[PDB]
Amino acid sequence: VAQISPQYPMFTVPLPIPPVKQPRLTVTNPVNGQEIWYYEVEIKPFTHQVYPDLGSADLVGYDGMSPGPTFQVPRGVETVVRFINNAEAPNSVHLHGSFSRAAFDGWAEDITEPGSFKDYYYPNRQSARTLWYHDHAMHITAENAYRGQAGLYMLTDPAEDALNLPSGYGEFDIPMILTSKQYTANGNLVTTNGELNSFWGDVIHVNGQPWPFKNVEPRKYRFRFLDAAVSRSFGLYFADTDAIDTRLPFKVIASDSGLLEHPADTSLLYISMAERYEVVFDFSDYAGKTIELRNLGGSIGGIGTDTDYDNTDKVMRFVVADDTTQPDTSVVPANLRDVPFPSPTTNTPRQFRFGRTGPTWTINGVAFADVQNRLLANVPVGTVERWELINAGNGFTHPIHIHLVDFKVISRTSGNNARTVMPYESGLKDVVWLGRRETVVVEAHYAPFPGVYMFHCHNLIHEDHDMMAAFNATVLPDYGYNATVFVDPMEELWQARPYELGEFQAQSGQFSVQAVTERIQTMAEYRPYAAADE
Ligand SMILES: *[C@@H]1O[C@H](CO)[C@@H](O[C@@H]2O[C@H](CO)[C@@H](O[C@@H]3O[C@H](CO)[C@@H](O)[C@H](O)[C@@H]3O)[C@H](O)[C@H]2NC(C)=O)[C@H](O)[C@H]1NC(C)=O
Ligand SMILES: *[C@@H]1O[C@H](CO)[C@@H](O[C@@H]2O[C@H](CO)[C@@H](O)[C@H](O)[C@H]2NC(C)=O)[C@H](O)[C@H]1NC(C)=O
Ligand SMILES: [Cu+2]
Ligand SMILES: [Cu+2]
Ligand SMILES: [Cu+2]
Ligand SMILES: [Cu+2]
């Protein structure tokens, strides 16, 4: 249907690469003698000239940019990030893909007010994977994410680096953060405020840029796909502009939680909100050609319900040189890793129905705001459970996300007989797409940390109004590991604290090296992640 946003000069602006975020300090952990990397991120308003010949867009971003800066953290290095709210609305940061403790996970009511900050303590112990950090504040998550509070967080491992996949952040390892937005006649964003069904967007962005292009060499690139859109799901394919409907083969090497067991040979990649898929595309057969990354129409070929617009079939263009300047020394091995699948369970699956209750998006008839009713599962730490995730509706779809865990996709049924489990769903994930009339069973190890965690639809419009609930990963009173201060996301110890802008700017007061060092060493003494040691 007709594009609403003004006409954009397609494929004329180079793909931006978010800069790598550097830590301010390292602090010695007195428990283990190891360095904890300490970072500061200031959440603040900024404007960005999206349309060349119109006015600017109003954004609020991590370090005043969108996407936020990219974190790059080696497995085994703990990090503390001081997220500083210098904006106009509260925030709650979630590191999506991280088994963070309840109070460091972005619980939706665990907000930071403007003129406050919160120290998030991250474990960085899980398998190499593409995480992303983004806003999770109750009621306002869609608008906070839409206006720019999302960025990438790459957990690296020299074992994955030894596979010799295409490498170098911004060289042959390229972030591909997909969003879908709408702009006014004067080039400002159309707000998501007021939208209660879905905010599709008619302008496709990669790394914050409408319909960009990139010059590539005829060799292999790693692409880290992330659907950071408010409501838009994609069906991605590559085509030569000389044969724009002919899909070119590629390999999926990783899902939300890390590498697949083997690359999945693929010409079409379904990716819904919050899903990450890493792809190796080989441009060697397309020297001197232009390859367009495109998006399936027909509401992702009958899987979705998303509205299609004039240019939502287009993502970006790659212009391929005639030759490489350096040898392609990268490979995609047939055997990537042994995926650490959870134990199979014979426990009867729990059922969660994703539907509407009057005008409100609900789980088993419940809204997250309803404290009394929203705790839907008590799961002893170490238990494996199958959850049967049910979309009974034909008129909407739900990418379902479960905090804490990585899960195996066991089964998909479709009331439209459309599809079962995809080859790139063979590994471990933390989001799975319930297409039209789809039921998915997932299997997860509820481990290794006790606490109260969220699960929800990651259509941010549905999540906000109000398709989200909680489970409690429970322990017996003799468990240890300071569980008493780590199970409650609202624990006073870990709450946001006020700051004065002056001290932040001067790096004085509670921003002094001494104050930060004492705060982190005190946090580290509680040993938040000890239960995951090996
Ligand atoms: C989620 O599960 C956790 C347990 O994994 C729950 O925390 C536990 O809450 C129980 C009941 O409040 C506590 O036991 C009680 O302790 C008090 C005070 O010492 C005592 O007077 C009672 O007779 C009883 O023994 C338990 O200590 C606590 N455990 C931990 C590790 O914090 C938590 O309540 C659950 N959260 C929700 C919202 O259900
Ligand atoms: C639970 O957290 C407490 C408080 O941080 C830890 O106790 C401290 O242990 C340190 C060693 O880093 C001592 O020097 C402090 O004097 C302790 N403070 C108190 C009040 O005990 C404790 O080690 C943690 N326990 C576990 C199991 O992680
Ligand atoms: Cu998320
Ligand atoms: Cu998450
Ligand atoms: Cu939904
Ligand atoms: Cu969440």
Numbering used by the authors: 1 to 534
Which of the paper's sentences describe this entry?
Trp396 was mutated to alanine (MvBOxW396A) in order to enable direct solvent access to His398, to phenylalanine (MvBOxW396F) in order to introduce an aromatic residue not capable of crosslink formation, and to aspartic acid (MvBOxW396D) in order to disrupt this site by introducing negative charge. The structure of MvBOx was not affected by the mutation of Trp396 to Ala and Phe. On the structural level, the mutation of Trp396 to Phe allows for conservation of the aromatic moiety in the proximity of the T1Cu site, whereas the mutation to Ala disposes of the aromatic moiety and instead allows for solvent access to His398 coordinating T1Cu. The W396F mutant retained affinity comparable with that of the wild type, but with a lower maximal reaction velocity. The K1/2 values for the wild type and the W396F variant are comparable (0.060 ± 0.002 mM and 0.079 ± 0.004 mM, respectively) but Vmax of W396F (8.8 ± 0.5 nmol·min−1 ·μg−1) is roughly a half of the wild type value (15.8 ± 0.4 nmol·min−1 ·μg−1). ABTS binds to both mutants with a significantly lower affinity, but the maximal velocity is not affected. The presence of the Trp396–His398 adduct in MvBOx plays a minor role in its thermal stability as follows from the slight decrease of the melting temperature (Tm) of the W396A and W396F mutants (by about 5 °C and 7 °C, respectively). Mutations of Trp396 influence the enzyme activity but not the enzyme structure (except the replaced residue).
